[PDB]
Amino acid sequence: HHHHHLKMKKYTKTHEWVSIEDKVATVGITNHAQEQLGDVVYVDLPEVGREVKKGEVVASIESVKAAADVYAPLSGKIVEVNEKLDTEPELINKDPEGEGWLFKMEISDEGELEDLLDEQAYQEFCAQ
Ligand code: NA
């Protein structure tokens, strides 16, 4: 038997998602979020190497009619950004929870994951 990886998807009430693989969290905005924003025209992504705390503003998204800040769902360090979004920010509309992911981070405190919503709780939250 081999050491089990940690794999979960979590959500925030600010309509962000976090896909976790051991210590690496991939973060983006949910389908619900992109629906509210409309056609995305511009993304500002975080800088790789940046140390962030849960709640800090790490990205900005601008659409035709609106704008939203993206908050760090967890504490840790930015390790990768989705550079293709600088040229193709509409991938956020096309596939917000897949291809349109924003950044990946190495997390510092796994206990923070227990503060986020699971998929059932999030789907309920959106429905309500
Ligand atoms: Na879960």
Swiss-Prot record:
Pfam families (UniProt xref): GCV_H
Span of domain Lipoyl-binding: 24-106
Keywords of this entry: Lipoyl
Gene3D superfamilies (alphabetical): 2.40.50.100
Free-text cofactor note: Binds 1 lipoyl cofactor covalently.
Residues spanning the signal sequence: none
Positions of post-translational N6-lipoyllysine modification: K65
Required cofactor(s): (R)-lipoate
Entry's Gene Ontology BP terms: glycine decarboxylation via glycine cleavage system
Cross-referenced CDD domains: GCS_H
Keyword field contains Acyltransferase: no
Statement: the UniProt record of this protein carries the keyword Nucleotidyltransferase: no
PROSITE patterns named among the record's database cross-references: BIOTINYL_LIPOYL, LIPOYL
InterPro entries xrefs: 2-oxoA_DH_lipoyl-BS, Biotin_lipoyl, GCV_H, GCV_H/Fam206, GCV_H_sub, Single_hybrid_motif
GO annotations of cellular component type: cytosol; glycine cleavage complex
Family label: Belongs to the GcvH family.
Complex formation: The glycine cleavage system is composed of four proteins: P, T, L and H.
NCBIfam families according to UniProt: gcvH, PRK01202.1
Function according to Swiss-Prot or TrEMBL: The glycine cleavage system catalyzes the degradation of glycine. The H protein shuttles the methylamine group of glycine from the P protein to the T protein.
Protein name (Swiss-Prot/TrEMBL): Glycine cleavage system H protein
